[PDB]
Structure 1
């Protein structure tokens, strides 16, 4: 590496990389709505008796 490279390129560290020690920074929360919810697939009909 020291003798047979002769040219190097440097970029800023990509933010997709995380050191293994900092694995708490990858903990995140996802919320799922209650399974008791019922989703309506029927249209509403309007009417009058007057």
Structure 2
């Protein structure tokens, strides 16, 4: 590394990388709606009896 490499390139640390110690920063919450919900596939029909 010291003798056989001539030039080096440096960039800001990508934010996607994360050390193993900071694994709790990856904790996140996702919400799924209740399974009792029923989604209608039938259209509404409009009528009058007058």
Task: Give the TM-score of the pair, scaled to structure 2.
Answer: 0.98
| Inter-partner Cα distance in structure 1 for 2:29 and 2:49 | 51
Runs of 4+ in 1 over 3 A off after TM superposition: none
Deviation at 1:13, TM superposition (A): 0.4
Deviation at 1:31, TM superposition (A): 0.1
Map of 1:1-50 to 2, 5 A cutoff? 1-50=1-50
| Inter-partner Cα distance in structure 2 for 1:5 and 1:26 | 36
Task: Give the TM-score of the pair, scaled to structure 1.
Answer: 0.98
Deviation at 1:48, TM superposition (A): 0.2
